[PDB]
């Protein structure tokens, strides 16, 4: 019997916890900056309200009332929120925890305990307004995160179906196909397609027409040219797809993402859950946001069954931690825990009342301030404290210098120090930092 | 139906957000105007981490690996963080869910100090802490009443230790707002030194003491690690600012949207995209209608019933003179100014 956390789950050091601060500034930041409000649900849904998914879910033991589930995701316990709540249009965002009983990757990449970040626009709005909004909002946030620069995939899964139609899939096998075709973007077409026809049994004949399509991206031109193609433009699913598609670039040209926008083909995930648009951002490479139009889920816990149209996206807010805490390692480069904006010492030896007597008054001005928990502490270590806890300043109180009513403001890094009348100390701390 | 969260739990709605975020700007202000860390851990642990009235506790099935166990107390997370990590030194501060099955999920917020450190200064500090969060957290007065286990107990030595807090509390401007009183108890099974708790004047409001052997239980050397700590019961707060927020006539907002991008003309949709946008990626956050060509009444009311107080007209004779206008929601009175003046016009009337 050990001390340790269970199975897959995690510490976050208060090193972590200022990173991952950090990144949900800038994300909630962006979403406030979009007029979303927020939402919370409990960390437990009433088990049966989670069926209908893969039975990786923790499950509670009994002893009292009925039986619990942890939540394994945020969608669902929106879509139970908005049927109990009897909404018919919202814009929110929700930032939690999710819990789902995997084996935790050992390289690693998977968890059992992580966090979650989804946005959505619930409601029946005009053609493909929303869904563009969600493409701004997703590089605007991986945009201001400084993470490299990235691309962002979008699709529609009419577009897939039907082409997958038009190509010639057994709607018994089409399934299978789409999470194998989704492999493109991680390996080759050619290693796709050798896969597929060895553990398929479908005719390269048709795999060969699949791969005159999949392998295409493009911009705007792309979605015009398939416009033009006539086994497709005789699809209505599909002539769907890509008109959504069509007005869907205008309005991100307007929006001025036309260029890190790709229309790639071979983008095909979640089809459980995606009846419109489908996003994926990614690095330059590895994912970092996805997302698209459900229409038909929310409407999965209503009485009568009335839908409730929506859109949404889903940062990866675990991954982009990692590249953060790693781009901070990589400059070698400490990262402050903590706020505190001067540490109050004292090299005499009976001036702790003193030291109290000063701090209150920052305290009560406002500005954070801290000191050392020993009466007589030494000077030196009192500075080395300062330089790993990246502290900024520290007012130093002397007894002839008590005597002048002044502090003397030796800063930590330059080592400079400067006489400070206790009236002006105030707006002297606010002014040597923010 | 009979759709149903989960008995002693309730969802939060915007509203209910809008109060939890505020109390939590106070309280995290306040953390982090005595430079506390911050740390989080795992929500269930292992059941045996959480033994020794003990089996009000949450549980997990057997899943087929380890037993775990929703945490039940904010302290014992922290005292198997601090023990794992063989911490000797940490002031820290945390606020998260617990679950205790007796509401029943439910938000704790926890501070503590800990470390060998000379006599009464981080005791001192707690209730300068304490006292700070309570005044600016808008409520009356508190008299936090203070008091020793070592008295109730040897019992001297904790006279001498309540002798020597109250100068520095009378250092802190603290004195007058605390109180002496001896039938203050419970909790009692697992401080050490100092216990104290505030109540408010017209309860439960906040609570807590010094606890020193809490620590060294995981400890397989058995070194104990001092600490003190405090929790403030944030879910009465909640309750009181949202019930001073309804007496108080004003409406509560859900969102920070300064700007509703508009127009009662039609076709002018694309135009209030490029607006929004420019709007977006300047530092101002303004909304727009998911319509084509909305009329101007209904966006005019979504205002004045989201807290959205000004409204950017775009109209074809405005376009034309690069030149937009603005209506405040509040005062109807227009103003029209040039599409470079538009985002400092906004950082302007907001």
Not at 234 to 243: P, S, V, W
Not at 395 to 405: R, S
């Amino acid at each position: 019997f050990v001390l340790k956390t269970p199975k897959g789950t995690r510490d976050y050091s208060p090193r972590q916890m200022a990173v991952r601060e950090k990144v949900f500034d800038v994300i909630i930041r962006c979403f406030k900056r979009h007029g979303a409000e927020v939402i919370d649900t409990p960390v437990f849904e009433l088990k049966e309200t989670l069926m209908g998914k893969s039975k990786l879910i923790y499950d509670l033991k009994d002893q009292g009332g009925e039986l619990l589930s942890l939540r394994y995701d945020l969608t669902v316990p929106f879509a139970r929120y908005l049927a109990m709540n009897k909404l018919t249009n919202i814009k929110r965002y929700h930032i939690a925890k999710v819990y789902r009983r995997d084996n935790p990757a050992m390289t690693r990449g998977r968890y059992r305990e992580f966090y979650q970040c989804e946005f959505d626009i619930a409601g029946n709005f005009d053609p493909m307004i929303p869904d563009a909004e969600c493409l701004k909002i997703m590089c605007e946030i991986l945009s201001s995160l400084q993470i490299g620069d990235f691309l962002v995939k979008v699709n529609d899964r009419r577009i897939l179906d039907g082409m997958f139609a038009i190509c010639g899939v057994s709607d018994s096998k089409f399934r299978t196909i789409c999470s194998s075709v989704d492999k493109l973007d991680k390996v080759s077409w050619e290693e796709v397609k050798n896969e597929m026809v060895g553990e398929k049994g479908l005719a390269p004949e048709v795999a060969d027409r699949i791969g005159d399509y999949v392998q295409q991206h493009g911009g705007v031109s792309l979605v015009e040219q398939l416009l033009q193609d006539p086994k497709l433009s005789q699809n209505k699913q599909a002539l769907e797809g890509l008109g959504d598609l069509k007005l869907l670039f205008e309005y991100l040209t307007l929006f001025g993402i036309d260029d890190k926008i790709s229309f790639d083909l071979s983008l095909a995930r979640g089809l459980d859950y995606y009846t419109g648009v489908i996003y994926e951002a990614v690095l330059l490479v590895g994912s970092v946001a996805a997302g698209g139009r459900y229409d038909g889920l929310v409407g999965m816990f209503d009485p009568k069954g009335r839908k409730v149209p929506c859109v949404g996206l889903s940062i990866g807010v675990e991954r982009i931690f990692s590249i953060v805490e790693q781009r901070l390692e990589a400059l070698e480069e400490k990262i402050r825990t903590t706020e505190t904006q001067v540490l109050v010492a004292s090299a005499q030896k009976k001036l702790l009342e003193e030291r109290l007597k000063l701090v209150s008054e920052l305290w009560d001005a406002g500005i954070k301030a801290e000191l050392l928990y020993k009466k007589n502490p030494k000077l030196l270590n009192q500075l080395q404290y300062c330089e790993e806890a990246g502290i900024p300043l520290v007012a130093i109180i002397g007894e002839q210098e008590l005597k002048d009513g002044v502090i003397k403001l030796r800063s930590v890094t330059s080592r400079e120090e400067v006489d400070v009348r206790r009236e002006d100390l105030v707006e002297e701390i606010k002014r040597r930092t923010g």
